[PDB]
Specification:
Organism: Mus musculus (Mouse)
Subcellular location: Membrane
Largest sheet: 5 strands, antiparallel
Order of helices and strands: EEEEEEEEEEEH
Protein name: G protein-activated inward rectifier potassium channel 1
Distance between the termini: 49 Å
Family: Belongs to the inward rectifier-type potassium channel (TC 1.A.2.1) family. KCNJ3 subfamily.
CATH architecture: Sandwich
Helix content: under 10%
CATH superfamily: G protein-activated inward rectifier potassium channel 1
Number of helices: 1
Number of strands: 11
Structural class: mainly beta
CATH topology: Immunoglobulin-like
CATH class: Mainly Beta
Number of domains: 1
Subunit structure: Associates with KCNJ5/GIRK4 or KCNJ6/GIRK2 or KCNJ9/GIRK3 to form a functional G-protein activated heteromultimer pore-forming unit.
Radius of gyration: 18 Å
Strand content: 35-45%
Shape: globular
Length: 197
Amino acid sequence: RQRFVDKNGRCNVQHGNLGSERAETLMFSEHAVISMRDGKLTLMFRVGNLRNSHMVSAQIRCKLLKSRQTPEGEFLPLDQLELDVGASTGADQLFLVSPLTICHVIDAKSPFYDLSQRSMQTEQFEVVVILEGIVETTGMTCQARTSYTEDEVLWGHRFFPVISLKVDYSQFHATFEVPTPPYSVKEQEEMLLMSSP
C-alpha cells in the first residue's frame, strides 16, 4: 500500500493524540507479559518513545535484579543477571518506527527458565530495562529506564495491537488474557524428555 518508511528515511506512521501529558508515559508499557509467541514462552513488554526527546533508533538491554544464594552459600542481596533480548541477532538495536514488542525468549540460558505460573506467586524479582537512543533533533545520547517487579509481569497475557494504516497510542499499555500453559519452560522440556517414545 504505502511505505512505513520513505526513501528519504522519513517515517510515515502518525501517532494518535497524546493528551496534554508532558510526562514520559509512552516510552515503556506499564506491565510486562509472558505467553506464547512463535512457539516459545516469551517474556514481553512494549517500547514506545519519549514525547520531548523523540528517538530514531536505540539499543536496549535488560537485567534481572534478585537476591540469590550461591552454591557456596553466599547471599547476594541484589544480583544482576542478563536477560537476552536479542544481542546475538541484532534484535536489541531498535528501529523506533512505532511501538515495539521486546521479546525475551525463555530458554535454558534465561533466568526465567524455571519460572512458572505458580512459582510466580512466591518469586521476588525485578526486570530492569535500559534504553539508550538517538534523539532525532540532534543525535546526542539519552537513556530511559524502567522496572517490572513480579506483580507487573502478567502470566498468560498478550498486548493489544496499536497499529493501523496509524498508532493507537491509547492501547499502548493494554493487555488481554490468552490460553497459556501454566508450567515453566524447564518443566515443559522435562515433560518432553518424559513423553518421548
